[PDB]
Design a protein around this nucleic acid. Sequence first.
RNA 1: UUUUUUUUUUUU
Length: 693
Amino acid sequence: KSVYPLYYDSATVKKGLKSGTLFKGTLRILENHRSAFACMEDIPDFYVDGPIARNRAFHNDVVIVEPVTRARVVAIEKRAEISKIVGILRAPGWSKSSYAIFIPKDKRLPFITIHKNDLSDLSGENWIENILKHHDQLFSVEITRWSIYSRYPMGVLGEKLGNITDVEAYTNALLLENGISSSPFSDEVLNCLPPDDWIISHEEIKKRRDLRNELIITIDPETARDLNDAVSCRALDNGTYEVGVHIADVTHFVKPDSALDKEAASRATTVYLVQKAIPMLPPLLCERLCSLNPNVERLAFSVFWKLDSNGKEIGKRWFGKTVIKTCARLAYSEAQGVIEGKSWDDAVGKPIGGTHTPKDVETSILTLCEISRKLRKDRFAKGAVEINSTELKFQLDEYGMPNKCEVYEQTDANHLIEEFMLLANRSVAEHISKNFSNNSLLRRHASPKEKQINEFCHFLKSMNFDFDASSSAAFNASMVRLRSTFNEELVELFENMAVRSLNRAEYFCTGDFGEKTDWHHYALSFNHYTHFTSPIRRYPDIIVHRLLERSLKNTSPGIDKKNCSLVAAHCNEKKEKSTTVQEDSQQLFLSVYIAEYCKKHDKKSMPVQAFATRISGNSIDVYISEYGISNRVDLSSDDRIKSFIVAPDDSSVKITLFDDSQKTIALTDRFQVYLYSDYSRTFFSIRCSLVSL
RNA sequence: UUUUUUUUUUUU
Ligand SMILES: [Mg+2]
């Protein structure tokens, strides 16, 4: 007897769809398994309990369910590509010969059966012994077939990624999950490279604008090796300034349809991890020839504006190929120190090649900072949205183990660079959209989804607050009132929920959207925007560089609307996967940090302060702002606790202990919890407990 | 575990 029911016929499925019985939506399987939801955007979402009702479906699988808000899967319309199944292997029947038991890291993926002695590195006689010997080794499996007469599918074990306790092996496994190429560059791509001893041609120096003698700097963080941006300011004889943005001319090295170009389009973006980084381009270009290192002549595209003390564009812009030699390289911290009024030797402490005096650079930094402050105030006043977001910055020891973990605050220098990069991006977008209105690669951000914003508004209604989503400007105004209404940590949580409410930003080809009103950036309130200020780490910036060059030459776009759409979609998906990878890396290093804290301070958990976001059934969702993480204190897992009572309103929960001290805690209350890195389960899992371990 | 929304922007 088949464990699962047969998928209905195509005609029967269509008939049921016209009969209101059948339904169609995406599927989201929950981490705790057995529980899944048919994600229907309009009609109420449906629930699914048990893999029997799941009928051999996976996460993000567009499926056709039938009501049996519960429902049974009867047809799969589309399957999302399962990018590898990394995990571990356990002996058959582990506390007995049989098929090997593969356990994926994603709990959403069911167990897998590895056929009799299926392997190459541990297959043969004594296979069980080899499994046990390599039990603490992460491996990877592929799916081969799922027999309806088996509750689990089957699959071949791939390459052994390696020690689970090895951070780098876990990293390689995570890369494998989201399909990010960690292999070295192909020898043909290296053959595409120019000679390493390439020198600046006098012909090219005359063909371009010679800004070498100018004062140009690169404000980038301390741990930066690929420099793309360069800012400059020019005091004009009147009250105005000529501000310039200079971006490494990668397209001068990367030529269309070359093997280098193909690998760049394949990787789409540079993936940045905590301990290392996967580059999009080979290091010769990414770290030497194109990187805007100090005191080196470099070929770069440049955009100039004429702005007043308020930052309004008074004079005509200028676009063109230039050759520049940056006066100095700066860190964001040192730039902030300069802005705060300190002396160059007290903050930066670097030599400034050229006639440029220290006070010249100081004046330039302060001028650019004031202009950037004015432009940021105007941008937010125009209708933009201010979200600070969260990111976990780690300081590592010589061995790579996390010694420090902290939240990142953006100082005024960060916004200084940010505003001018945004200005450059917007100007380039406007120009290339005006010229090549059919084959232009820009970025868009539509209005937020009504569903998420309604949920967030109801959450604020629970906290007796109203959010006007009628406009981005009203959204930001409600955010400001909220910040002036609650404590800063609650406000941080609210910013988290706000960024959740936003819609996914995406690249696009102007030809696909007939109406120009659809080319808009809701959060930035811009009418035109693209990515152009980072061509060494975002292939869309390479495409935009080529489009800008052609627009200055008034020639053809050289790229087809369809091909442009392909590049846009591929790069959007690659950016999704890269974001996920970086977040998971941060999570991994946070777990290792908690483990090191427990080891050094002779405890089993780290004590932290947390705010109670939700009180449901037998658990409480808590947010730890010190590390910007959302965990759950399971009232059931707390066996040390004696009992509890949740009221029908879920706004307060009373607690009773064995020492008979009863005490009640409500929503948005600040209380202490403990974070511990559970390694007893198969993989790294940060868990939170109310009681100290 | 067994009820769910994880996406603005800069730099890296
Ligand atoms: Mg930079």
